[PDB]
From a paper:
In the complex structure of [name]-choline, a molecule of choline is located at the active site of the C-terminal domain, whereas in the complex structure of [name]-AMP-MES, an AMP molecule and an MES molecule occupy the active site. The MES molecule, which should be introduced from the crystallization buffer, occupies the corresponding position of choline in [name]-choline, whereas the AMP molecule is stabilized by the N-terminal domain. The morpholine ring of MES is stabilized by residues Tyr197, Glu213, Trp251, Trp254 and Tyr268, whereas the sulfonic acid moiety forms hydrogen bonds with Gln31, Lys45 and Asp176. The adenine ring of AMP makes hydrophobic interactions with residues Ile43, Tyr90 and I183, and also forms hydrogen bonds with the main chains of Glu89 and Ile91. The ribose moiety makes hydrogen bonds with the side chain of Thr96 and the main chain of Glu180, respectively, whereas the α-phosphate moiety interacts with Asn32, Asn181 and Asp194. The Fo-Fc omit map at 3 σ revealed poor density of the ribose-phosphate moiety of AMP, as reflected by its low occupancy. The similar binding patterns suggest that AMP and MES in [name]-AMP-MES might mimic the native products ADP and phosphocholine, respectively. Moreover, in the structure of [name]-AMP-MES, only Asp176 stabilizes the sulfonic acid moiety of MES, with Thr29 on the P-loop flipping away from the active-site pocket. Similar to hCKα2, the N-terminal domain of [name]-AMP-MES rotates approximately 18° towards the C-terminal domain comparing to apo-[name] by the program DynDom, making N- and C-terminal domains much closer to each other. The P-loop in [name]-choline is close to the active site and the residue Thr29 of P-loop interacts with choline, whereas the P-loop in [name]-AMP-MES is far away from the active site and adopts a conformation similar to that in apo-[name] structure.
Afterwards, the [name] [name] phosphorylates choline in the cytoplasm to form phosphocholine, which is further activated into CDP-choline by the phosphocholine cytidylyl transferase LicC. Therefore, the [name] [name] is crucial due to its role in initiating phosphorylcholine metabolism pathway. Here we determined the crystal structures of apo-form [name] at 1.94 Å (apo-[name]) and two complex forms with choline ([name]-choline) and AMP/MES ([name]-AMP-MES) at 2.01 Å and 1.45 Å, respectively. The structure of [name] adopts a protein kinase-like fold which comprises of an N-terminal domain (residues 1–92) and a C-terminal domain (residues 93–283).
Author numbering: -2 to 284
The structure:
């Protein structure tokens, strides 16, 4: 039983009646060590332990508010606990739920485009103002080692040069999810599709979210065009250039996230190296 699992057991004890007990806390699948299934006498809970070393990256109070603010959209699953002290989310467990991946997401544009419209047109004022270039600096501060990626100064300066272009185009400010990996979509056995894991949610340009959806599921040009056709409306305008720019910023940011996570003891192999190289590729294609 890990330290993280012991802390989870303690936090869940507050959700139980005098009779009930925590039976087990086990690590769920996935890339990171954040996700756990907790079993109690009469209840199962999905747990995301996101707080470890992320105090300066994920503003826990911002995100606790964002949960209660976003609840009536009906997109996320039910929350039972959001622990500010350690950064731990305790949610409902949906039995026999299907987690989406790139292939399955591509069959469900009829559901997913309206979902993204719902969030981007919510008119909700989330706590948090996403600043991608400040985000880069946050990771740079937290990382102890000499940056392990090749040709970093030239790449960094090219990435930071995109700030001026974004200012010229004009950056929009809407409620965004910020982390549209396909595995953040889960389907109930009865058919309802959820969008989960809003830990990064913030006010941002909606083209960030589109870039993330497209990049994280490796959409083809045909899939991008088809999705944009579905998603585009007067209240959800589309900018292809912004999408291209945000893809580069995402690969940069998540490559730095990788270094920091590995410094804390995780092993993601060449995940970060490859994302960084894709930023390099994107910079060349953009220019
Ligand atoms: N309410 C739920 N019921 C069943 N599985 C879930 C639930 N919420 C999250 N999960 C799973 O846990 C993962 C959450 O972390 P992530 O892998 O980053 O999406 C999802 O991919 C789902 O597979």
């Amino acid at each position: 039983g890990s330290h993280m699992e012991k802390i989870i057991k303690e936090k869940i004890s507050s959700l139980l009646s005098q009779e009930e007990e925590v039976l087990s806390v086990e690590q769920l699948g996935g890339m990171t060590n954040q996700n756990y299934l907790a079993k109690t006498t009469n209840k199962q809970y999905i747990v995301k332990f996101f707080g470890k070393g992320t105090e300066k990256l994920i503003n826990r109070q911002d995100e606790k508010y964002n949960l209660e603010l976003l609840k009536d959209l009906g997109l996320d699953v039910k929350n039972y606990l959001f622990d500010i002290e350690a950064g731990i989310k305790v949610n409902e467990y949906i039995e026999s739920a299907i987690t989406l991946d790139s292939t399955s997401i591509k069959t469900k544009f009829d559901k997913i485009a309206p979902i993204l419209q719902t969030i981007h047109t919510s008119a909700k004022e989330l706590r948090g103002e996403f600043a991608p270039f400040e985000e880069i600096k946050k990771y740079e501060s937290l990382i102890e080692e000499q940056i392990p990626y090749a040709n970093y100064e030239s790449v960094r300066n090219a990435v930071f040069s995109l700030e001026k272009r974004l200012a010229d185009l004009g950056v929009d400010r809407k409620s965004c999810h910020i982390d549209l990996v396909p595995e953040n979509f889960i389907e109930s056995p009865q058919g309802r599709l959820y969008l989960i894991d809003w830990e990064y949610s913030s006010m941002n340009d909606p083209m960030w979210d589109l870039a993330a959806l497209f990049l994280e599921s490796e959409f083809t040009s045909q899939e991008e065009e088809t999705f944009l056709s579905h998603y585009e409306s007067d209240q959800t305008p589309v900018s292809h250039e912004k999408i291209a720019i945000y893809k580069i910023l995402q690969d940069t940011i998540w490559s730095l996230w990788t270094v920091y996570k590995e410094e804390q003891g995780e092993d993601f192999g060449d995940y970060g190296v490859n994302r960084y190289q894709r930023a390099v590729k994107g910079l060349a294609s953009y220019g």
